Amino acid sequence: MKYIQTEQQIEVPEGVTVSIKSRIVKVVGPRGTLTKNLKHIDVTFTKVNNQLIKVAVHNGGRKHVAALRTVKSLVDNMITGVTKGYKYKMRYVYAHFPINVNIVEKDGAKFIEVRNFLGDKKIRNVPVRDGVTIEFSTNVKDEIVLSGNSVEDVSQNAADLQQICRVRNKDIRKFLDGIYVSHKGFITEDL
RNA sequence: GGCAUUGCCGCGAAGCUACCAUCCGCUGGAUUAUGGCUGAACGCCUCUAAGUCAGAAUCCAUGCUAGAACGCGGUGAUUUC
Ligand SMILES: [Mg+2]
Ligand SMILES: [Mg+2]
Ligand SMILES: [Mg+2]
Ligand SMILES: [Mg+2]
Ligand SMILES: [Mg+2]
Ligand SMILES: [Mg+2]
Incomplete structure (x- = not known):
């Protein structure tokens, strides 16, 4: 239906630093460092308040907005892997x-x-x-x-x-x- | 010794030859079906949508054959008259 804007939130706990270049996500936490290449999804990351990363799809279709939540879940899993394991x-x-x-x-x-x-x-x-x-x-x-x-x-x-x-x-x-x-x-x- | 259109018979070297004889017939990737991981869509679920793992006598390579007679490279010598 070509939703104008769809966004998801990625909560960042305190001991976690997330470096997001174009679509290469690097998550650093107590347990180590994880890296993921998300250049196949065409999403946009923005840091809000150093504890929150928004990820958005503009003018996205059904599959695109599904992949947006997939991206959010993947980054959440990276953060969980570097905090809890x-x-x-x-x-x-x-x-x-x-x-x-x-x-x-x-x-x-x-x-x-x-x-x-x-x-x-x-x-x-x-x-x-x-x-x-x-x-x-x-x-x-x-x-x-x-x-x-x-x-x-x-x-x-x-x-x-x-x-x-x-x-x-x-x-x-x-x-x-x-x-x-x-x-x-x-x-x-x-x- | 000749002839019998290789006269016939036994053996017969060489050559050719027989699963009638002997030797030899390779290992890497990508995949199908399928089974999975992560994971939304659809607060759950889900092998699938993004991404991804393994996997067939399959495919492409490795290997083997030919070498484009108008594809190519390296190299030797190049006419005392
Ligand atoms: Mg006579
Ligand atoms: Mg005679
Ligand atoms: Mg049985
Ligand atoms: Mg699962
Ligand atoms: Mg797929
Ligand atoms: Mg030729």
Whole structure:
């Protein structure tokens, strides 16, 4: 309907500095620095009061104003990643064969190694994206935690780990073995 | 020794040749379907709309064959009369 103006607000907490050149967004917080290239969306950023960034689409269509809120959510996720962090908890699920998950090194690349999935002899190797920390959770059986500033990076690593453990040539409603994302939250608690 | 239109028979080197013999037949990317991530649209949801991951005997490359006889480069020597 070609809305004249549509805008969204990006709240910036105190310990966060957001540098926005043309469409290269850099967010700096306690936990590190994130960078995103948004040159494919054609939006306009403006700083209001050093705690608020407005992002606007002028004379935008339906898809354009949808992508505006997408941009706002992406920048909010960058800020949340540099303030709270992002942690995805996955639980290994298996009926008979225990799934052995470990961190191995190959040329200093820190792969996640999956052995014995459904009794397989094949060894699954999922590379760990830079910035993603892998921890094996004590006091919870068969739980892997992936943490990082970039929600995209941690979620993609969890997705890769889940997808590498897909069951083939079997009724997946019966053979439920795999490594599934069980929780998606932040690193810092109750903030 | 000749002839029998290579007279016939056995063996027969060379050459040619047989899954009737032996050897050899490569690995990278991008993708389809599909399964996903982030994520609005549509306070939720959503693989999709922006962006994005993986992925087929597929495609393009690597590799192999020919080398444009009007595509090109480097290089040697260039007629004592
Ligand atoms: Mg069957
Ligand atoms: Mg005679
Ligand atoms: Mg004779
Ligand atoms: Mg999701
Ligand atoms: Mg798309
Ligand atoms: Mg020629």
